[PDB]
Each structure stands twice: as structure tokens, then as C-alpha cells.
Amino acid sequence: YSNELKELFLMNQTYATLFTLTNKIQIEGDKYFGILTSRQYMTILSILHLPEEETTLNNIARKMGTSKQNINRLVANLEKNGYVDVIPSPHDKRAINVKVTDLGKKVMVTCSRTGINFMADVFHEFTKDELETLWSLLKKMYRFNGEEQDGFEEIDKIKSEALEEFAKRRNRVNKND
Amino acid sequence: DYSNELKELFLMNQTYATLFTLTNKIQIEGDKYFGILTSRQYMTILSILHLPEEETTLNNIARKMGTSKQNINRLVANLEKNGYVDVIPSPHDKRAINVKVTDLGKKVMVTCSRTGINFMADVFHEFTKDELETLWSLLKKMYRFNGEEQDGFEEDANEIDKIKSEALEEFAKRRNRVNKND
Ligand code: NA
């Protein structure tokens, strides 16, 4: 059974590493963002990526890979902080729609800029090839049970100083003293 | 002009997005498999069992889990209320604690570990050993982006009785998808 033991060990270690990595990346992302948590940020972004009419708890839950119950708690938190407004859905009386407010959008402009520095730092050791490989393997793991990911104008909004700072942080161009 | 930078940023955004939503799904799915613990509870108890008894401080457990002291304090308080751990003073520092897994905590972990093996088979059934080595390696690389490397569970490597042999047989059959038969 040595082949089986070695496969199991490798699976255990890959799982444990996924879990502790996401813990670390969550904590680190919260420090970068500063004014939102990573979970708040990703929930607002998920809402911005849906059509207003389709911003239901179920659709938001599917986009985030999580349960309706978790999105319900997150959305109530966003509403009490004044980041979203929650109205009844016009298609279904049991469902909701979520609109991002002016405050929400303001905080997202600030967090997106910081987000660009965070991506630069997190992936500075990766080639483009290795990122594509990582992304591909994470998508394969997603569909282990038969159900596939629902992933994520926008280009024109990124200003040239952000991309300049991104290039410098990613490439470690600076000759350190 | 910044087309290359935009491309790289987009790809990093998608990888991060996919990582986040994947671990959300794996957590919910792991909760369903284990049944009598959540995944977080399970991994916290396992982190405690990989540390020496005297070095089961909040800080050391946090470091093993890749999270904060405050998050471990809440997890450990939830485990204590459930009867899975006892919390006692650290003998080496008056401020610090130690955490001991109770007999009820050990029994629940034996049940969850067995289920754990079937979960691993299912989650990774499409992966070759080589893909797993590649994924693991790339996850370790991302971990150390800030200069701090992972403090992992790799000391698991360094007696197969009948019960273990049956668990390993079920593992191989699940992994190789001998059902979808009819
Ligand atoms: Na974004």
C-alpha cells in the first residue's frame, strides 16, 4: 500500500497548505485593504459583477462559492455600514436585490488601488506560466463534485501611476541598499 | 504600453478570485463530509496535535494555522465549550496557555480522520500525482510572498493493520472512480 500512502500524504499536505495559505492571504489582505476585510471586498465586487436584477442571495452565494446563509450575514453587515442598499427583488417576492451605494463605491475605489499593490506582492515570484498553471489546477479542484466555477468598463478606469507602481513592486526593479 | 501589465494584473486577479471561492467551496464541502465537526474545528485540533504539549500556545497554533491569535482564541473557546479541549496555564510563561485534546476530542478526530481519507480521494480524483506535486509547490511559493515560509505538517512522512488496509483499499477505489458503473 505504499503508493496509496504516498498519494494520501501528498493529498493531506496539499489540502493543509491550501487551508493555511488562504488563512494567511485573508489576514494579509485585510492589512493591505485596511478599511474593508477581504471578505467584504470580494462580496461587493461580486455584486458589482452581477446585473442589478440578478443580485439575489442565491446568485451572490454561487459566485462566491459559499452558502446563502453566509452571504445573508455578510450583506446585512454591508448594509448597516451603509455600503449597500437592499431592496425587494422585482421578479420574485421571496428574493432580494443589492445596490452598492456612493459610500460603497468610494471605499471600493480606495481598496482596488491597494488591491493592485497586493497582487504585485503576492505573485512577485511567479512567472505568467506558473500563474496560468496555478489558476488551472485550482479550477480543476473546484469541480471535484461535478459543479464548475462561476468566475469574475474596468480596463479604462486603471490609471497609469497604479500600473507603474505595480510594475515596480512585481519586478523588484529597485536596487536595494 | 501597459498592455502586458494589465494582462498580468488580470491573471493575478482571476487566480486570487479562484483561490478564494475554491476554499469557500472546500470548506462547505468538508463540513458536509465530516458532519460532526466543521473543517476549521478539525484543522485546529490537528494543529494542536502536531505541536508538543508544552508549546501549544495561541501564538504557536496561530502560526501553524496561518492565522491570527484572536481567531485562534475564538476557535479554542468554541472547542472548550464543546468539551473537545481543556485549557490550562502554560508552565513556561504566566501569560501564555497550553491546550490539551480530551478523550472526547480524540474520539471525534478518529471518526473525522476516517471520513477525511474519503474526502481526499474525492477532492483529488482527477489529479495525477504530478499535478498534486505541482499544485502543492505553487501553493508553498504563494505562501512565502512576504519572506515567511510555511510551518507545515510535513513531519507526517518520517504499522498497516487490517483496519488501515481497508481504509486504504476504499481510498484507492474512490479515487479511481470504479462507480458511475450502472
Ligand atoms: Na478588481
How would you sum up this structure, described in words?
- 2 copies of one chain form a homodimer.
- Chain A is mostly helical and 177 residues long.
- Chain A has a single domain, classed as Arc Repressor Mutant, subunit A, CATH 1.10.10.10.
- The first copy, chain A, is built from 7 helices and 2 strands, in the order H-H-H-H-E-E-H-H-H.
- Chain A has a two-stranded antiparallel ribbon with strand order 1-2.
- Chains A and B meet through helix 1, helix 5, helix 6 and helix 7 of A and helix 1, helix 2, helix 5, helix 6 and helix 7 of B.
- The structure holds sodium ion (NA).
- The site of sodium ion has 2 residues of chain A, from loops.
State the gist of this model.
The PDB classes it as transcription. The structure is a homodimer. With 177 residues, chain A is mainly alpha-helical.
Largest sheet of chain A: 2 strands, antiparallel
Dominant shape of chain A: globular
Query: What is the architecture of chain A at the second tier of CATH?
Result: Orthogonal Bundle
CA-CA gap between termini of chain A:
53 Å
Strand content of chain A: 5-15%
| CATH first level of chain A | Mainly Alpha
CATH superfamily of chain A: Winged helix-like DNA-binding domain superfamily/Winged helix DNA-binding domain
Give the helix proportion of chain A (percent range).
55-70%
**Number of E strands of chain A:** 2
The class by helix and strand makeup of chain A works out as mainly alpha
Largest interface: A-B, 69 and 69 residues
Query: What strand order characterises the main sheet of chain A?
Result: 1-2
Ligands and ions found: sodium ion
Tell me the CATH topology of chain A: Arc Repressor Mutant, subunit A
**Strand and helix order of chain A:** HHHHEEHHH
Radius of gyration of chain A: 19 Å
Total tally of structural domains of chain A: 1
Oligomeric state, counting identical vs distinct chains: homodimer
Keywords (chain A): DNA-binding, Transcription, Transcription regulation
InterPro entries (chain A): HTH_MarR-typ (IPR000835), Tscrpt_reg_MarR-type_CS (IPR023187), WH-like_DNA-bd_sf (IPR036388), WH_DNA-bd_sf (IPR036390)
Domain HTH marR-type (chain A): 1-143
GO molecular function (chain A): DNA binding; DNA-binding transcription factor activity
